[PDB]
Amino acid sequence: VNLINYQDDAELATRAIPELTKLLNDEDQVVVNKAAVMVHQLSKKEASRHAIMRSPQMVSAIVRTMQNTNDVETARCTAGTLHNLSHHREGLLAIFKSGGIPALVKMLGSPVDSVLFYAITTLHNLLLHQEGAKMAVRLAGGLQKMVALLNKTNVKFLAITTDCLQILAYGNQESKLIILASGGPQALVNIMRTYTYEKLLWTTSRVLKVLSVCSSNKPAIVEAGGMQALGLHLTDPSQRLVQNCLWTLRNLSDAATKQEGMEGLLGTLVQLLGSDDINVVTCAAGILSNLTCNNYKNKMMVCQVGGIEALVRTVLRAGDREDITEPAICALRHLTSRHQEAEMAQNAVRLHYGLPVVVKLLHPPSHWPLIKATVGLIRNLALCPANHAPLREQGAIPRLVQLLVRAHQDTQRRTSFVEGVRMEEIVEGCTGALHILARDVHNRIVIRGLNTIPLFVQLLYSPIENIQRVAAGVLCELAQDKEAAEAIEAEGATAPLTELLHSRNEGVATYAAAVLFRMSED
Amino acid sequence: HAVVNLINYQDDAELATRAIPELTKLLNDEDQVVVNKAAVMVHQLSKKEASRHAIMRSPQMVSAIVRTMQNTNDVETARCTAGTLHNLSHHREGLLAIFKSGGIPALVKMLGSPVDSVLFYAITTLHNLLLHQEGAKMAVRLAGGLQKMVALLNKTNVKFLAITTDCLQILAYGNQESKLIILASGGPQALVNIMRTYTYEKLLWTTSRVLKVLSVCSSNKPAIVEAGGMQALGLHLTDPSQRLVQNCLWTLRNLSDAATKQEGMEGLLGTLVQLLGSDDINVVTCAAGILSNLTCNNYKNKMMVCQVGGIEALVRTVLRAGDREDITEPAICALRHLTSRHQEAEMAQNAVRLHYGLPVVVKLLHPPSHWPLIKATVGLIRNLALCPANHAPLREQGAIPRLVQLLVRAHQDTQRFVEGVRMEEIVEGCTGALHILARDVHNRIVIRGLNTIPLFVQLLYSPIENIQRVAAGVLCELAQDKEAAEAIEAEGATAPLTELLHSRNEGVATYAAAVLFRMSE
Amino acid sequence: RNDVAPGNFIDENLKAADSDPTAPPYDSLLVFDYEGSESDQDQDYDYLNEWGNRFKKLADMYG
Amino acid sequence: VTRNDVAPTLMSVPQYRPRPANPDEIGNFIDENLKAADSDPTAPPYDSLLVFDYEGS
């Protein structure tokens, strides 16, 4: 009786479809209204639904009725009708081919909640399943109307909406921009800090994540308080919510170096470094890396919330995984210079057993980016005299010199970039770590015993001021000892240093004048 | 009844088939009072569908009716004959009969009748003929109908006008001579008048269409504008009738290029800007195009468009548009015009950036974009550069790299009209932009940093007085830096430049001077 | 799209060469050419009997 | 992608005295002037910024 009354009511429908149509076309506003109501009730019956779904003229008349109507009821009805229809692929293609998207979009401007709900839901289905729906919605001007709807308060509505926003924003610049232009960041953030409906929060974060790769939304989201809002969820049970915020947080990170009030975030991140999830730890390490770049208040705060230990432990546990070690090490480098807490951090790395693992990263497999970072970190650690011996005993000096030599030979055979890093950096970096390392008499002996003097002198003839600086600088530290001083003089440093006196670089000239003096100083 | 009718039908019919001959013979009589009477009975018969068909199926009958209608001097007769034809006019069989009987010229003649009933009948019939009988358009046209119909545009019956104007649309469609006749008859003015006098939707619509068909004419275009077309059509842009609106939009757009001096365009300009927000891309595209042209060389309109928020609306238009060049081009040109030669042009240059226009603007420089669009985009970029605040942004977006890249492909061709645009323009275009961007230090660096000087100076070896002017300005700007000032003479700078000191371009001179000048310091 | 037109003396007579209203790039039009694409149940013919004799045959049929 | 060094937004620390005559003092001229070059915060290594851009799928 169920497969007997289907084709019955269905056929019976094909019997009234055509008339109902003509009625919606009727001029008498009231005739139409009533007709819409009838078509609406009809779309509830799966039987009829297929009859409308197959009558292009009916659909087109429903769409038309919806957009031109002024009856809050006709609106709700025609809107619903399209919705009920939007559940089948033919309904999608129908609604599509008959210009329903633009009408639906216009409806997103309705004050009638029921209508809005229908409209946004129809569109959603269209976005998810109708080929060509996305670009159509972009052309109709939907994004603005959608961001404007973020003003609503029905979580389930917002859920859909943001997901529409997400679907249209993924990989599309004009869209990302329009969302931005329409104050999307501020709306999205607000959601993040106000509601607690998992699905919504997750979806909203997926939108933010998509926007975070945009050069123009990045700062906006930050300025909108995005870092902190996003931070609020790093503890949620939903691993998917957490991971999306972490990702989004990392993309925003470079644009958030001047942000204030980050304690909590900086705090949580440090904690997360102890996760079991590699993706979590990675992101955390990455974020901390950027957030501690040239922001002294941030550095100070991290050191004070157990960051050094955390970072050290991470680097330890990460082993060969450079996706974790480079940002982690960079963080540690950042934390060990230019701020009142640097000294503490310098001893902290040691007192937590990091020196070994750190010196080790200077060796293969470690890649250039990582080595560069490690060299830099070792230089800072060397600022603390309580690190000279320990650091020496880890065989760092021999190795730095090795990297210095080879890299420098490379910068020479390129006269007659690698993994991004350019050897000239490794030259400056290594010579620099030897310069700060050359502060310990025992180290001065080692550096000297590796037959490095002749090379250092050669570096004075370098065109790069910074290299000139560290070369002259390490030379100055060595030259404070007679034999050394003369060995240097004997290498012909006297000539080049002399001219390095007329150097525009204060430090460079000083070091020069210092050696020239140390040499002749009987 | 279900059959009584069906019986009386064939009956009243067979009876008519028997009466026609007699009535025919009567219409062909010399005593016009006989004919007059005959005409009356015929008309009556023509009112019942059975009697009707007998008449249609009779070439001699219809022929008689026609002759009588056109040669009679009795109103009551003309009223009857014309009404008869009117009735036959509703059957394919009848339309053809009227046609074969030479009714069209007789009907056209009737368009001269002072009797209102005759006019309605006549025009209605011709309309049915124009719509369903092959040959009617040409026959009516050849019969001088156009002049007759335009002449009736002074009538006030909206329904009657609706038909008369739709007849003109049908005849004028893609037929230059017809359109030229409608004009010589004063159609344009009469039509615009209808547009600003009545409120009947069908008439407004119908009328807007003749205007549309008339707007594509080089001759009618100027007329419709002087008539007050733009202002007129602007009046309905917010009408609930979407078909009226779209048609006015099309017409407005077609006339747009000729209205660049019309005034009282504030009502229009406002709505258009508003219409850019429409959910209908075609409404937007039109509005965009209309705005493009109306903001062309008219500081007054430029002013207005900005005051009402056109900048944001247009930028957003471009954003929505994406790859659709039919939308971006006019939109972009509108922004270009809006960002120069007018008080608020400074503020405009800012607004674009302020609404995230720069990112997408620059993007439009790269493919799939076409030359017509690039040429536009380039011009917009240059105007956006007049604002210092945009110097950095434009660079960051990659404006400079691509500009130069274009200038190269563009130049290599002014040696050995692609996509419509002549490369000499692309050259004058890009360099022109670079010139303004060059005002920012960091840019100069990026500019010369791409080794452009080899080209720039070599662009002094161009006859195009404008391509010259900018090349000197790029240098005049680039030579402002020592390291560069020298790299310029290091290619053969003074050589041409000296000459260009005598050029008749108050511009090329002042530039050529400061260039050599600084060059040696 | 048809285009439509409107020793330090150097550094001051130059400020005009930059702010020249009669200088490029000029605005431009774009010519668009879109053209698109009686009921009567009255069987009262009695008046025929009150007419000429030439209508006799007719009056006879229609009353 | 690739990292980008960032200049240290100083809080002001430069301070190098000019080489005085009376060579009998150009010897301590360096000692103090040297302590300055070793202090100089405007010397590498600089902190660096990596720019992540994971959009997902």
Short mmCIF file of N, CA, C and O in Angstrom, two decimals, chain A residues 170-171 176 209-210 213 247 250-251 289-290 293-294 296 299 326-327 330 333-334 338 379 428 466 469 506-507 510-511 513 518, chain D residues 3 5-9 11 16 27 30 33-34 37-38 40-41 43-57:
data_model
loop_
_atom_site.label_atom_id
_atom_site.label_comp_id
_atom_site.label_asym_id
_atom_site.label_seq_id
_atom_site.Cartn_x
_atom_site.Cartn_y
_atom_site.Cartn_z
N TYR A 170 38.10 28.59 1.30
CA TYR A 170 39.22 27.71 1.00
C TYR A 170 39.84 27.99 -0.37
O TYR A 170 39.15 27.96 -1.38
N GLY A 171 41.14 28.28 -0.38
CA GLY A 171 41.83 28.55 -1.63
C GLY A 171 41.34 29.67 -2.53
O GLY A 171 41.73 29.74 -3.69
N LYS A 176 38.43 35.38 0.56
CA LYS A 176 39.13 35.68 1.81
C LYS A 176 39.14 37.18 2.02
O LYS A 176 38.88 37.66 3.12
N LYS A 209 41.53 29.38 10.24
CA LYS A 209 42.72 28.73 9.70
C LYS A 209 42.87 29.09 8.23
O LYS A 209 43.94 29.45 7.78
N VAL A 210 41.78 29.00 7.48
CA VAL A 210 41.83 29.30 6.06
C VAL A 210 42.20 30.76 5.79
O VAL A 210 42.91 31.06 4.83
N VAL A 213 46.21 32.16 6.27
CA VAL A 213 47.30 32.05 5.31
C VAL A 213 47.33 33.29 4.42
O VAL A 213 48.28 33.48 3.65
N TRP A 247 47.22 25.13 14.47
CA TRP A 247 47.63 25.41 13.12
C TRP A 247 47.42 26.89 12.83
O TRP A 247 48.33 27.58 12.37
N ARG A 250 49.80 29.08 14.55
CA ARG A 250 51.12 29.09 13.96
C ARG A 250 51.17 29.96 12.71
O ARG A 250 52.15 30.66 12.49
N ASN A 251 50.13 29.93 11.89
CA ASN A 251 50.16 30.78 10.70
C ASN A 251 50.15 32.25 11.09
O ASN A 251 50.80 33.07 10.45
N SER A 289 58.62 29.61 18.75
CA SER A 289 59.74 30.13 18.00
C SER A 289 59.44 31.56 17.58
O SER A 289 60.11 32.49 18.02
N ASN A 290 58.42 31.74 16.74
CA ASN A 290 58.08 33.09 16.29
C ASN A 290 57.74 34.07 17.39
O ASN A 290 58.24 35.20 17.38
N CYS A 293 60.46 36.08 18.98
CA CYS A 293 61.35 36.78 18.06
C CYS A 293 61.33 38.30 18.24
O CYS A 293 60.38 38.98 17.86
N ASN A 294 62.39 38.81 18.83
CA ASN A 294 62.54 40.23 19.09
C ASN A 294 61.50 40.85 20.02
O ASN A 294 61.32 42.07 20.03
N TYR A 296 61.06 41.11 23.82
CA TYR A 296 61.65 40.81 25.11
C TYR A 296 60.65 40.44 26.19
O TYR A 296 60.92 39.57 27.02
N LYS A 299 59.97 36.80 25.74
CA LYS A 299 61.11 35.99 26.15
C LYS A 299 61.10 35.83 27.66
O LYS A 299 61.08 34.71 28.19
N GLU A 326 64.29 22.44 14.81
CA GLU A 326 64.66 23.79 14.36
C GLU A 326 63.90 24.91 15.09
O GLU A 326 64.51 25.84 15.61
N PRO A 327 62.57 24.85 15.09
CA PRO A 327 61.90 25.93 15.80
C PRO A 327 62.29 25.91 17.28
O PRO A 327 62.55 26.96 17.87
N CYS A 330 65.70 27.37 17.68
CA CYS A 330 65.61 28.81 17.43
C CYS A 330 65.03 29.49 18.65
O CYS A 330 65.52 30.53 19.08
N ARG A 333 67.49 29.90 21.11
CA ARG A 333 68.46 30.92 20.76
C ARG A 333 67.90 32.27 21.14
O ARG A 333 68.58 33.09 21.76
N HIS A 334 66.65 32.49 20.75
CA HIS A 334 65.96 33.74 21.04
C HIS A 334 65.96 34.00 22.54
O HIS A 334 66.25 35.10 22.99
N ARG A 338 69.48 39.18 24.31
CA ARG A 338 68.71 40.41 24.32
C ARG A 338 67.50 40.57 25.23
O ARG A 338 66.41 40.96 24.78
N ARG A 379 76.45 30.10 20.31
CA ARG A 379 77.10 31.37 20.55
C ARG A 379 76.49 32.04 21.78
O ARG A 379 77.22 32.48 22.67
N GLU A 428 80.07 33.34 9.03
CA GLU A 428 79.86 34.34 10.06
C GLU A 428 79.41 33.68 11.36
O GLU A 428 79.96 33.96 12.43
N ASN A 466 80.07 41.93 8.60
CA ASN A 466 79.84 41.07 9.76
C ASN A 466 80.91 40.01 9.95
O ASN A 466 81.33 39.72 11.07
N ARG A 469 83.86 41.61 11.07
CA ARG A 469 83.69 41.85 12.50
C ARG A 469 84.11 40.69 13.39
O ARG A 469 84.95 40.84 14.26
N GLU A 506 81.77 50.52 13.57
CA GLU A 506 82.40 50.78 14.87
C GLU A 506 83.10 49.55 15.43
O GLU A 506 84.32 49.55 15.63
N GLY A 507 82.32 48.50 15.69
CA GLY A 507 82.87 47.27 16.23
C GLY A 507 84.07 46.75 15.45
O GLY A 507 85.11 46.42 16.03
N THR A 510 87.18 48.96 16.00
CA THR A 510 87.66 48.74 17.35
C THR A 510 88.48 47.45 17.45
O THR A 510 89.61 47.46 17.93
N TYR A 511 87.91 46.34 16.99
CA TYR A 511 88.62 45.07 17.05
C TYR A 511 89.94 45.19 16.32
O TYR A 511 90.98 44.75 16.83
N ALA A 513 91.86 47.94 15.54
CA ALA A 513 92.78 48.75 16.32
C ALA A 513 93.27 48.00 17.55
O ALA A 513 94.39 48.21 18.02
N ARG A 518 97.39 44.95 20.31
CA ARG A 518 97.79 43.73 21.02
C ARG A 518 99.08 43.16 20.43
O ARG A 518 99.95 42.69 21.16
N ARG D 3 63.44 31.26 6.61
CA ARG D 3 63.39 32.21 7.72
C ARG D 3 63.87 33.59 7.29
O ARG D 3 64.49 33.75 6.23
N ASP D 5 65.73 37.09 9.03
CA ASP D 5 66.29 37.72 10.21
C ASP D 5 65.55 39.04 10.46
O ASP D 5 65.01 39.66 9.53
N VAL D 6 65.51 39.45 11.72
CA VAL D 6 64.82 40.66 12.15
C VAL D 6 65.74 41.53 13.00
O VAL D 6 66.23 41.09 14.04
N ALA D 7 65.97 42.77 12.58
CA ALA D 7 66.84 43.66 13.34
C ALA D 7 66.32 43.85 14.75
O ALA D 7 65.13 44.05 14.96
N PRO D 8 67.22 43.81 15.75
CA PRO D 8 66.86 43.97 17.16
C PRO D 8 66.35 45.38 17.42
O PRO D 8 67.12 46.33 17.30
N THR D 9 65.08 45.53 17.77
CA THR D 9 64.58 46.87 18.06
C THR D 9 65.25 47.28 19.37
O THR D 9 64.77 46.98 20.46
N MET D 11 67.01 49.47 22.51
CA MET D 11 66.46 50.29 23.56
C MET D 11 67.57 51.31 23.81
O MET D 11 67.66 51.92 24.87
N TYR D 16 80.69 54.69 21.24
CA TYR D 16 82.12 54.55 20.98
C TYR D 16 82.85 55.89 21.00
O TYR D 16 82.60 56.75 20.16
N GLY D 27 95.71 53.67 24.63
CA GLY D 27 95.78 52.30 25.10
C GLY D 27 94.58 51.89 25.93
O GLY D 27 94.13 50.74 25.86
N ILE D 30 90.98 51.98 23.97
CA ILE D 30 90.44 50.75 23.44
C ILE D 30 89.76 49.90 24.51
O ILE D 30 88.64 49.45 24.31
N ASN D 33 86.35 51.26 25.02
CA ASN D 33 85.69 51.28 23.72
C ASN D 33 85.45 49.84 23.23
O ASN D 33 84.51 49.57 22.47
N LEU D 34 86.29 48.93 23.69
CA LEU D 34 86.21 47.52 23.33
C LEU D 34 85.04 46.89 24.08
O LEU D 34 84.24 46.17 23.49
N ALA D 37 82.01 47.39 22.11
CA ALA D 37 81.82 46.55 20.94
C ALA D 37 81.37 45.15 21.34
O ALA D 37 80.67 44.48 20.57
N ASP D 38 81.76 44.70 22.53
CA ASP D 38 81.39 43.38 23.01
C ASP D 38 79.97 43.41 23.57
O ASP D 38 79.29 42.39 23.64
N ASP D 40 77.58 45.74 22.36
CA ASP D 40 76.74 46.04 21.20
C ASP D 40 75.69 44.99 20.84
O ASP D 40 76.00 43.92 20.33
N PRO D 41 74.41 45.31 21.11
CA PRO D 41 73.29 44.41 20.83
C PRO D 41 72.96 44.31 19.35
O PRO D 41 72.29 43.36 18.93
N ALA D 43 74.51 43.31 16.91
CA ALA D 43 75.39 42.39 16.23
C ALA D 43 74.76 41.01 16.23
O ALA D 43 74.11 40.62 17.19
N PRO D 44 74.94 40.26 15.14
CA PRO D 44 74.38 38.91 15.03
C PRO D 44 74.77 38.05 16.23
O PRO D 44 75.73 38.36 16.94
N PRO D 45 74.04 36.94 16.47
CA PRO D 45 72.89 36.49 15.67
C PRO D 45 71.60 37.24 15.95
O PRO D 45 71.34 37.65 17.08
N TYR D 46 70.80 37.44 14.91
CA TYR D 46 69.51 38.12 15.05
C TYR D 46 68.43 37.05 15.26
O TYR D 46 68.61 35.89 14.88
N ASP D 47 67.32 37.44 15.87
CA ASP D 47 66.24 36.48 16.07
C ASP D 47 65.65 36.24 14.67
O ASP D 47 65.85 37.06 13.78
N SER D 48 64.98 35.12 14.44
CA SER D 48 64.43 34.90 13.10
C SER D 48 62.96 34.52 13.09
O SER D 48 62.42 34.00 14.07
N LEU D 49 62.31 34.79 11.96
CA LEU D 49 60.90 34.50 11.78
C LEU D 49 60.64 33.55 10.63
O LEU D 49 61.08 33.79 9.51
N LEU D 50 59.93 32.46 10.92
CA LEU D 50 59.56 31.49 9.90
C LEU D 50 58.09 31.74 9.63
O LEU D 50 57.33 32.00 10.55
N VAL D 51 57.69 31.66 8.37
CA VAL D 51 56.30 31.93 8.04
C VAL D 51 55.50 30.72 7.60
O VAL D 51 55.54 30.34 6.43
N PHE D 52 54.74 30.15 8.52
CA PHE D 52 53.93 28.97 8.23
C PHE D 52 52.66 29.34 7.46
O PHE D 52 52.09 30.42 7.67
N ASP D 53 52.22 28.46 6.57
CA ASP D 53 51.01 28.72 5.79
C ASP D 53 50.17 27.49 5.45
O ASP D 53 49.71 27.34 4.31
N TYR D 54 49.95 26.62 6.44
CA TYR D 54 49.14 25.42 6.25
C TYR D 54 47.66 25.81 6.14
O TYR D 54 47.08 26.35 7.08
N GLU D 55 47.05 25.53 5.00
CA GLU D 55 45.64 25.86 4.80
C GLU D 55 44.75 24.63 5.00
O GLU D 55 43.55 24.75 5.22
N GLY D 56 45.36 23.45 4.93
CA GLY D 56 44.60 22.23 5.08
C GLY D 56 44.13 21.78 3.71
O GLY D 56 44.72 22.16 2.69
N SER D 57 43.07 20.98 3.67
CA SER D 57 42.52 20.49 2.40
C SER D 57 40.99 20.47 2.46
O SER D 57 40.35 20.51 1.39
#
